[PDB]
Structure 1
Amino acid sequence: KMLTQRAEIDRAFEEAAGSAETLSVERLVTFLQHQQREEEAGPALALSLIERYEPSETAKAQRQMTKDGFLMYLLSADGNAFSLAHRRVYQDMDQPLSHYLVSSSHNTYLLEDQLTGPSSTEAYIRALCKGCRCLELDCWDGPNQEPIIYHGYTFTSKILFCDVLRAIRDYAFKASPYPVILSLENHCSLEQQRVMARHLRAILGPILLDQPLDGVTTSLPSPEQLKGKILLKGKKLGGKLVPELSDMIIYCKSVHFGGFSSPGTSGQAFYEMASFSESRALRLLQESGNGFVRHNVSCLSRIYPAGWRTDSSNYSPVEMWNGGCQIVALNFQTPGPEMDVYLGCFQDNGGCGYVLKPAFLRDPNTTFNSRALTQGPWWRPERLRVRIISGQQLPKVNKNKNSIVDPKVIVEIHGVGRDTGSRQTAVITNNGFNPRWDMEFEFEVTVPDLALVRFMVEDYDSSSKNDFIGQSTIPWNSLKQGYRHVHLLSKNGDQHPSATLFVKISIQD
């Protein structure tokens, strides 16, 4: 009569049933296909839900759904605002690497700042477990002929190259079976480069991709063709680099950006990879546009934090993704809206690290440009309507010494320039347990395939700004309609024990 007794869960259930106290399979299929806008909505689905969520056994045997089970469903995997069908790998995985968005880390060794902070294998472990696929090892000479990793010329803690590798070996495929790219930033002496080469082949072993693939000769292989393998990125012999090492760079030869060009008469190759500071990438996306998109169809593009970000702060990755850029390196060790939109995007596709870019970005001859949209398959404007109905059991350990929270839900649309919007509810004074808002927002999203819906919850405070409580980012095409519950993740991406936001989602054309 407290934890339960969700006024709005009653308000939505009676709506369903009508005048009955339970949901007939017939009535349910109506709720599912009409409210829940379910394409599967038919007797069979409606029955799976009853058998998979109905608490009352009798009401389950007599093929019905009670308010208890109606709730048990809404709070469940199936009730979630994030398409449960997407919690599994479900996209084409036979496209070239340049047709995927690779989950990328920057200065992975770092656990904190870029100047005096610690470096730890824990950093590579934690990143790999967040499904990160492209790691970064800044290699340098170490005492007694053993290379070390650390952010050169700073007081950042140093760690052993070998240790870092053992760590990568163990956790590389815990969260995904898909290929991990080890970006090497070499500074070691030739004798220590030889050491690096010996540890790579010795520690990594068969997991390492030492030789090219037969048949792959005109374009990068696929995540499938490289499953459970690791490839190395770095400089490759143009003649200060040991053959032992260079022979290991096969599909990710580090090159300097020499300009775009299109398939018409020679340019960068599918095995070569340019890199860009967030600033430069933003410059080229403005000056070149689809010149860059086309460019990323064939080759991989690695983006990386500006240098002025010693605080290990991050950049919004969306604008980079919109330009086809695949290896957008962010400081995973830093909580913030940026890493939020980052992992959120990557929870998609079973959270396997690789995410197939929209078809218009895999078109070598595409004329798409995120900063100056034209007409094309990309322009397919919808209209999202989100009813921030009722949040429940919102965190409150942020202020250990007990009192009460002042909640407010911010809903923001992340996407192409035009679609980049945001809204928010009124603060519900002192109530994090059963806050009610019943407020609907409305967004117009011209280019949905590049959009992500972010539900964020704050703690209004005139003391120290509106404190962060929890949030959840859902990629547009992964958003479910009707009545759903949004499960709030913590500041570290760790889904809170039982913190959610009940909402009603709608998408019209």
Structure 2
Amino acid sequence: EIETFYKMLTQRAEIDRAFEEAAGSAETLSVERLVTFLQHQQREEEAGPALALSLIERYEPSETAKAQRQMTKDGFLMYLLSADGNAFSLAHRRVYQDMDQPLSHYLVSSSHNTYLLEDQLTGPSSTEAYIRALCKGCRCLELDCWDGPNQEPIIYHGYTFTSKILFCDVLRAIRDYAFKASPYPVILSLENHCSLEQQRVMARHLRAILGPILLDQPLDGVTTSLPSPEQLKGKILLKGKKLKLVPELSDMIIYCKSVHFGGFSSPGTSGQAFYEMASFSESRALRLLQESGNGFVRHNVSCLSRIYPAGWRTDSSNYSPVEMWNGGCQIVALNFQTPGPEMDVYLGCFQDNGGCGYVLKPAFLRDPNTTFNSRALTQGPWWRPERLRVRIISGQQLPKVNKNKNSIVDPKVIVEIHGVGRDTGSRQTAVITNNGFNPRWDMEFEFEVTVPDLALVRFMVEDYDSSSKNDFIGQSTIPWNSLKQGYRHVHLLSKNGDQHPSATLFVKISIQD
């Protein structure tokens, strides 16, 4: 029975079935019978004996089967639970994109009022908040500088009761973590409310603390465009007002001068210099996208636009980033402290390209002459309908979302499509009652996605509550082009972005044009 049990508790039919079909009669998968699976099922492009063999070498537990170039059901499952079996493309989990274009061509991971740990009104500020963001790959941070006691500038949310911290303390932390998660440039957005004296102090600290990391001179060459992530690699650039403002500071603003939004230079030649960055509240941006979608887009090709949360979000809530990315907006600032679908999608997007924090925009969003407008879709390269079929097969060890008691989860799965408005959709499965160890739904959904290049597929698992609002159990957001096909496992994350060791969803994905 001790056999039966570990052999029972640990026993997945869907897995068995999958092995069967692949292996057929055999009790094993031969390199050829693995290749066809890799091609027919997993749709690997690099399908071939080479891959198969590495899979077997990497995952096969049986020394006999290994040595004999075969895969057992055990190795089959291990492959399926590995980084290679992940629905989130392993290949995309390393920098693999063109890092040589001007900054304006990349979506950049950006945070809003980075110093804040909670609400915008009375919650605390901390260097920790900066460390956290940086550790999540954030590239563009915010510093709200105000004069402090003893000629030491402080950082906090002006005009509120949020707790304070030292500008210098913040600089050390940024210094210490700026590149822990990526080698690409960090941008510091300074909102400067300092007296000229304390501004001088700021400049002193910047130089003193950042030293060589700090970029304080234009890049030789770099004449008509913003440098590239590659060119700025290992650097930290300041973004702010450039000559009420001491030269010491103004002189350090090189590639990102804060400017008031002029408008878009289509009816002319020039508008904002590539080294000029405009900011838009969530609200204004929406409006501009609503009326000037293509203008904004075209603007965003050579120019970096920063977007920030609406003033009413004193709770540090977040808006949807997708809507801004659809306009090619690059520095879409969110409140990194706040868990929710928005940050889920945010970090899902940025888990791409090895999480270096810079993700190359689609080509049509890099064409100054594009006619694209996610709002008014016409024919163009962006238009490329695909049919996605996702089968939510089963769940493994869904985490017990507290309950402050001994209950059993009643899980259900929601699958969502995020992208151009036309494509957004959501579907949900039934609820399996009292089972988190191995609920089985075996439900399939199909979605039509017309602009996959801007889409993300999100899997969310909730604990169905009849009386209350359903608890969130886990989630995973995968950018369209990183979505792997065939049988895969979706590795669920907690609301804080943390990896849930053994919580997975087993699915079968198929994308067809």
Superposed counterparts of 1:7-406, under 5 Å:
7-237=13-243, 240-262=244-266, 264-406=268-410
**1:2, distance to aligned residue in structure 2 (A):** 2.8
User: How far 1:40 sits from its partner (Å)?
Assistant: 1.0
Paired position in structure 2 for 1:482? 486
Take 2:426 and 2:466, find their aligned partners in 1: how far apart are those partners? 22
Task: Measure, in 2, the Cα distance between the counterparts of 1:179 and 1:226.
Answer: 6
- Using the aligned pairs only, state the percent identity: 100
d(CA) in 1 for partners of 2:76, 2:239: 51
1:497, distance to aligned residue in structure 2 (A)? 1.6
- Note the C-alpha offset of 1:263: 8.5
Deviations 1:117-145 (A, max 9, x none): 00000000000000000000000000110
How far is 1:425 from its partner?
A: 0.2
Question: For residues 267 and 491 of structure 2, what CA distance do their matches in structure 1 show?
Answer: 45
SS at 2:444 equivalent: strand
Three-state SS of the structure 1 residue aligned to 2:171 is helix
User: Cα gap change, 1:453/1:319 in structure 2, threshold over 3 Å: closer, same or farther?
Assistant: same
SS in 1 for 2:160: coil
Q: Distance in 1 between matches of 2:41 and 2:339?
A: 35
Q: Please report how far the alpha carbon of residue 290 of structure 1 lies from its aligned counterpart in structure 2 after TM superposition.
A: 1.0
Question: Structure 1, residues 42-98: CA drift from partner, whole Å, max 9, x if none?
Answer: 111111000000001101111100000000000001000001000000000001000
Comparing 128-137 and 34-43, the one that deviates more: 34-43
Task: Return the alpha-carbon distance in structure 2 between the equivalents of residues 75 and 419 of structure 1.
Answer: 30
2:456–2:479 contact (8 Å) kept in structure 1: yes
Question: d(CA) in 1 for partners of 2:240 and 2:368?
Answer: 26
The alpha-carbon deviation at position 402 of structure 1 amounts to 1.8
Deviations 1:418-439 (A, max 9, x none): 0000001000011001100000
Q: In structure 1, how many angstroms separate the alpha carbons of the residues matched to 2:274 and 2:178?
A: 24
Deviates further, 79-88 or 394-403: 394-403
Cα displacement string for residues 98-117 of structure 1 (whole angstroms, at most 9, x for unaligned residues): 00000000000000000000
How far apart, in 2, do the equivalents of 1:461 and 1:172 lie?
A: 42
How much has 1:265 moved relative to structure 2?
Answer: 2.3
Q: Relative to structure 2, which stretch is displaced further, 459-468 or 320-329? A: 459-468
The change in CA–CA distance for 1:15 and 1:258 in structure 2 (over 3 A counts) is same
CA deviation profile, 1:222-260 (whole Å, cap 9, x unmatched): 0000001000000000xx000000000000000000111
| CA distance in 2 between partners of 1:84 and 1:353 (Å) | 17
Whole-angstrom distance in 2 between the partners of 1:145 and 1:44: 64
Distance, in Å, in 2 between the alignment partners of 1:447 and 1:414 is 10
Among residues 432, 451, 455, which one is paired with 1:428 in the alignment? 432
Q: CA deviation at 1:286?
A: 1.1
Indicate the SS of the match to 1:13: helix
Aligned counterparts of 1:267 and 1:483: Cα–Cα separation in 2: 50
Are 2:279 and 2:305, in contact at CA under 8 Å, matched by a contact in 1? Answer: yes
Q: How many angstroms does 1:488 deviate by?
A: 0.1
Q: CA deviation at 1:289?
A: 1.4
3-state secondary structure, aligned to 1:501: strand
SS at match of 1:497: strand
What SS does the aligned partner of 2:82 have? coil
1:403 deviates by: 1.8
Is 2:115–2:143's contact at 8 Å kept on the other side of the alignment? yes
Distance, in Å, in 1 between the alignment partners of 2:279 and 2:397 is 44
Distance 1:400 1:55, change over 3 A: farther
Distance in 2, matches of 1:221 and 1:442, equals 42
Is the 2:104–2:303 contact (alpha carbons within 8 Å) kept by the matching residues of 1? yes
> Could you report, residue by residue, the CA deviation over 1:251-280 in whole angstroms, capped at 9, with x for unpaired residues?
000000011113842211000000000010
SS in 1 for 2:414: strand
- Kept in 1: contact 2:388–2:512 (CA 8 A): yes
287-296 or 113-122, which deviates more: 287-296
Is the partner of 1:19 in helix, strand or coil?
coil
TM-superposed deviation, 1:464: 2.4
Q: Distance in 2 between matches of 1:98 and 1:315?
A: 22
Q: Which of the numbers 463, 467, 474 marks the counterpart of 1:470?
A: 474
CA distance in 1, matches of 2:478, 2:266: 34
Q: CA deviation at 1:455?
A: 0.4
CA shift, 1:397, in A, is: 4.6
Tell me, in whole angstroms, the C-alpha distance in 2 between the residues paired with 1:67 and 1:354: 39
| Contact 2:127–2:173 (CA under 8 A) maintained in structure 1 | yes
Higher mean C-alpha displacement, 257-266 vs 363-372: 257-266
- Deviation digits for residues 206-237 of structure 1 (CA, Å, limit 9, x no counterpart): 00001000100101000000001000000000
Q: Distance in 2 between matches of 1:405 and 1:179?
A: 43
Contact 2:79 2:85 in 1 (8 A): yes
- In structure 1, C-alpha distance between the alignment counterparts of 2:267 and 2:477, rounded to whole Å: 37
Is residue 401–residue 471 contact of structure 2 (8 Å, CA) maintained in 1? Answer: no
Deviation of the 1:463 alpha carbon: 3.4
Q: SS where residue 396 of structure 1 aligns? A: coil
Question: In 1, distance between residues paired with 2:299 and 2:402?
Answer: 45
Q: Distance in 2 between matches of 1:320 and 1:4?
A: 45
TM-score normalized by the length of structure 1: 0.99
* More off after superposition, 463-472 vs 130-139: 463-472
Q: Partners of 1:400 and 1:68 in 2: how far apart?
A: 36
Contact map agreement 2:432 2:440 (CA 8 A) in 1: yes
Out of 266-275 and 3-12, give the one that drifted further: 3-12
Any idea what the Cα deviations from partners look like across 1:155-205, whole Å, max 9, x if unmatched? 100000000110100010000000000000000000000000000000111
2: CA distance between counterparts of 1:235 and 1:2?
Answer: 65
**Do 2:85 and 2:487's aligned partners in 1 also have CA atoms closer than 8 Å?**
yes
Alignment partners' CA distance in 1, 2:36 and 2:152: 67
Structure 1 stretch displaced more, 57-66 or 456-465: 456-465
- Say if 2:38 and 2:52, in contact at 8 Å, map to a contact too: yes
The CA distance in 1 between the partners of 2:474 and 2:269, in whole Å, is: 51
Tell me the distance in 1 between the aligned counterparts of 2:194 and 2:466: 52
Q: Which SS does the other structure have where 2:476 is aligned?
A: strand
Deviates more, 1:414-423 or 1:2-11: 2-11
What is the SS of the residue equivalent to 2:504? strand
> 2:401, 2:473 within 8 Å by CA — same for their partners in 1?
no
Q: How far does residue 5 in structure 1 lie from its aligned partner after superposition?
A: 1.4
**1:128, 1:113 → 2: CA distance?**
19
Task: Tell me how far apart the structure 2 counterparts of residues 263 and 121 of structure 1 sit (CA, whole Å).
Answer: 45
- CA RMSD of superposed structures (Å): 0.8
Q: Distance in 1 between matches of 2:203 and 2:69?
A: 64
The structural deviation recorded for 1:400 is: 4.5
Helix, strand or coil at the partner of 1:123: helix
